[PDB]
Symmetry: C2
């Protein structure tokens, strides 16, 4: 819809930053659509990924990092706040120790920093969703 997908935006993150994504799955949960949010170290898509967040709607969520071209230890969660056929609001806060992910205002996942958030230069949002809003909070120093 509003924003093109894959959506790529240059970005800078530090403690206190928040990334807000508003969108909607393209198909019903029965068909297992995915949503993926990757925080990259460079503007190119083949670059390293500081924080990989992949949702298989209705099934599970996978988080990881890709360092020096290699995927590290995957963390898997079965927590599923997303609602079939509904628009969702996803907020990723950068805390000192980890990323906190809220879905529709509810804390749902956390991921301890493996690489400093300051290494992030780009965020890519893709897979089976329509994207209506993308915002990174640049109020803090």
């Amino acid at each position: 819809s509003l924003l093109p997908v894959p959506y790529t935006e240059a970005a800078s993150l530090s403690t206190g930053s928040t990334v807000t994504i508003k969108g909607r799955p393209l198909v019903c949960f029965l068909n297992e659509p995915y949503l993926q949010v990757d925080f990259h170290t460079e503007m190119k898509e083949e670059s390293d990924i500081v924080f990989h967040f992949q949702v298989c709607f209705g099934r599970r969520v996978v988080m990881n990092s890709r360092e020096y071209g290699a995927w590290k230890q995957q963390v898997e969660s079965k927590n599923m706040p997303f609602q079939d056929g509904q628009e969702f609001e996803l907020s990723i806060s950068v805390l000192p120790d980890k990323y906190q992910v809220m879905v529709n205002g509810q804390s749902s996942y956390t991921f301890d920093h493996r690489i400093k958030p300051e290494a992030v230069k780009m965020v890519q949002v893709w897979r089976d969703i329509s994207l209506t809003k993308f915002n990174v909070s640049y109020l803090k120093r």
Copy 2:
């Protein structure tokens, strides 16, 4: 690009029919983009799937059927004719005994019929690709 994705087209199949799909992966193989082709029994996406063909570019291909809302025996292949960053041409022929899938003119996968091809009423092509051409051969009786 040319055609919207998810792409849905009402269709009828029988022995001798061919479905030709031309497109291109949206991102590099390193990021594991997917391609999915589902032959449905009804015009709705939650309907049964006579033939499910899902490609995880660079990794594997999964084939199955969803009957009465339940996924059946999955068949997995590691055969991978698709080329990173290239446009592909995918042809699915309906033979008496099975579907034959050609990738860029090379026979690559087959799937024995679980349900008669005549039960198909719709084809949906989706996931991480841009679609330039979609055609079903309606020359045969």
